[PDB]
Design a protein around this ligand. Structure first.
Ligand SMILES: O=C(O)CNC(=O)C(=O)O
Ligand SMILES: [Mg+2]
Ligand code: NI
Ligand SMILES: [Zn+2]
Length: 331
């Protein structure tokens, strides 16, 4: 078995290998990359997402989210308080303000220490989940707005045509902005490209060990666990690396820098934080190997998780027994 210790793998495809997205994902899996839950892909030196980022300041962040924490430094939840709209130029100036800017630090490890020590005492503002793309339409390789759609994959694999669409999302971050422990909707893959700015640190649990993280989460967030049998679908809980190590949960960590792709694999729990002002783009995708994960994915039916239009068909076709209850949670 390849990569039996489930380490995060880093790939350096040539420009020739960068032509065929599906083929390269299958190659990475042939080498055991999925076992980690997360892989990094450094694009060939010839490749670019677009020519420059000089003209992005007028993009609107209609609903910036202030991420307010509750709990203790290593075990907390966050809720999202909606703020007034602002442009990306306004948000970048806010991220660089004395109140919100990255503190002085020696290296990524020092910054990671400062994040876990101090996150809960601040409420950073995240421009998350903005429909759109920063890939130039002329970028033909690994353009996250031109991928094969999940609906077309399900149709190719299973023969059933379904409604729904699959488009990318932009994330404008600042120091301490945080993504809570989660897997993707329907345990899909994700791909994330860091277009510009400061790094993003990731934590991940191997898919084979995901239920160990879920059991710890039920112990650490016991009221949330009674409320919902899949409460990590709410995307609000954080657990630090120190707490994971104390409880023997297998995980790995890696920092993504601007110009790099990350891929999360089906049922790979992940969490992390931004180092400073940045912009990322991400989208879900599927492969034939996903189908079995989609059929087994947990679902939130308590009403909290509320997701896209397109998840309907995935539940309806892959999880018909669950459909009725899940849809009640959506309505
Ligand atoms: O970058 C973020 O805030 C969160 N991204 C993801 O969870 C992802 O790409 O799957
Ligand atoms: Mg603009
Ligand atoms: Ni994700
Ligand atoms: Zn729920």
């Amino acid at each position: 078995a390849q990569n039996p210790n489930c380490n995060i793998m880093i790939f350096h495809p040539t420009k020739e290998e960068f032509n065929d997205f599906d083929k390269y994902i299958a190659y990475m899996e042939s080498q055991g990359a999925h076992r980690a839950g997360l892989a990094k892909i450094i694009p060939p030196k010839e490749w670019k997402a677009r020519e420059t980022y000089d003209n992005i300041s007028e993009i609107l962040i209609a609903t910036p989210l202030q991420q307010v924490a509750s709990g203790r430094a290593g075990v907390f939840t966050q809720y999202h308080k909606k703020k007034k709209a602002m442009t990306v130029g306004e948000y970048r100036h806010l991220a660089n303000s004395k109140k919100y800017q990255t503190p002085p630090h020696q290296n990524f490890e020092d910054l990671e220490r400062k994040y876990w020590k101090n996150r809960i005492y601040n409420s950073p503002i995240y421009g998350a989940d903005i429909s759109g793309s920063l890939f130039d339409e002329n970028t033909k390789q690994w353009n996250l707005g031109h991928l094969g759609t999940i609906q077309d994959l399900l149709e190719k694999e299973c023969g059933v045509v379904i409604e729904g669409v699959n488009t990318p999302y932009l994330y404008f971050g600042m120091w301490k902005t945080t993504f809570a422990w989660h897997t993707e909707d329907m345990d899909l893959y994700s791909i994330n490209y860091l277009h510009l700015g400061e790094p993003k640190t990731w934590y991940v649990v191997p898919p084979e060990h995901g239920q160990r993280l879920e059991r710890l989460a039920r112990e650490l967030f016991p009221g949330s666990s009674r409320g919902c049998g899949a409460f990590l679908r709410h995307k609000v809980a954080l657990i630090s690396p120190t707490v994971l190590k104390e409880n023997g949960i297998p995980f790995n960590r890696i920092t993504q820098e601007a110009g790099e792709f990350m891929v999360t694999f089906p049922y790979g729990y992940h969490a992390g934080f931004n180092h400073g002002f940045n912009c990322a783009e991400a989208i879900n995708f599927a492969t034939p190997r996903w189908i079995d994960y989609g059929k087994m994915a947990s679902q939130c039916s308590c009403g909290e998780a509320r997701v896209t239009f397109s998840m309907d068909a995935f539940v309806r076709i892959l999880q018909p027994e669950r459909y009725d209850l899940w849809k009640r949670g959506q309505d």
